[PDB]
């Protein structure tokens, strides 16, 4: 189907406690595959998925150098942002960047991304045209002017349309056992008495990949959206995800309620009920 690659980067300054901490991770779809942390002893980019381990030493050397260069650029950029916002050197600040690409089932570029944030707020983003910029404020307009003069958008476009898509396709092939496998949720319904008058029905979805899923409760075929407690999808820690949805039901009315599960790994959407 369709797939994505993303690189995420965070630098956090810490005045009086050395240089900023820099952490970057790379994902294909919902799979972490590389990481770099500046606070490691002799930091290197490290593999986090089995299918990237086969890349040779030249790959790891280049990735590591890019990560060190990015940490250094961020250190300088953090100093610049103190000027742009008239801020003192005493506080901790955050610089984030994400970039990457989406591809369709035929492997062609669907959309590219490159966006930066300061202290948790949008700063400057490359537009979907991969040719113009959206600056959030008058400080980011200074950056925009510099990046227009330096033709940064053209450099990003060339990467996003070329290497980003080409390497994503390589990873999808080398990792086809996992990246191209959807694991359906294992599902079940549990029953939790509240009183002699009511009980909670909780519909569980466990062990699924990728994270996208839809869980809903119906009563007599009508959606219970306003009455459903739906937890945020959460990582199991083994590559897979979990989610549940719960409704409070009158005692004895449990068989009116059906849980409906949609996920890419299912042969067909599921309808489940509580089974005492």
């Amino acid at each position: 189907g369709s797939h994505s690659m993303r690189y995420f980067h965070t630098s956090v300054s810490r005045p009086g406690r050395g240089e900023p901490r820099f952490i970057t991770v790379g994902y294909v779809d919902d799979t972490l595959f590389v990481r770099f942390d500046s606070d490691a002893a002799s930091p290197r980019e490290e593999p986090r998925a089995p299918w990237i381990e086969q890349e040779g030493p030249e790959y790891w050397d280049r990735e590591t150098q890019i990560c060190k260069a990015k940490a250094q650029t961020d250190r300088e950029d953090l100093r610049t942002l103190l000027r742009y916002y008239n801020q003192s050197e005493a506080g901790s600040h955050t610089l984030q960047n994400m970039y990457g690409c989406d591809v369709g089932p035929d492997g062609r570029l669907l959309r590219g991304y490159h966006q930066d944030a300061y202290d948790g707020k949008d700063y400057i983003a490359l537009n979907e045209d991969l040719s113009s910029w959206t600056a959030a404020d008058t400080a980011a307009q200074i950056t925009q002017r510099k990046w227009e003069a330096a033709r940064v958008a053209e450099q990003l476009r060339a990467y996003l349309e070329g290497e980003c898509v080409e390497w994503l396709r390589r990873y999808l092939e080398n990792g086809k056992e996992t990246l191209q496998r959807a694991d359906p949720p294992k599902t079940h319904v549990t029953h939790h008495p509240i009183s002699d008058h009511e009980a909670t029905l909780r519909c569980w979805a466990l062990g699924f990949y990728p994270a996208e899923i839809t869980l809903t409760w119906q009563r007599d075929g009508e959606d219970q959206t306003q009455d459903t407690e739906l937890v945020e999808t959460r990582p199991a820690g083994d590559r897979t995800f979990q989610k549940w949805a719960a409704v409070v039901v009158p005692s004895g009315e449990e068989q009116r309620y059906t849980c409906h599960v949609q996920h890419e790994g299912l042969p067909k959407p599921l309808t489940l009920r509580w089974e005492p």
Binding site: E63, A69, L81, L156, W167
Partner: peptide, 9 residues
């Protein structure tokens, strides 16, 4: 694989 960042804010 990554892209070199070659610009400053």
């Amino acid at each position: 694989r990554r892209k070199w960042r070659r610009w400053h804010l």
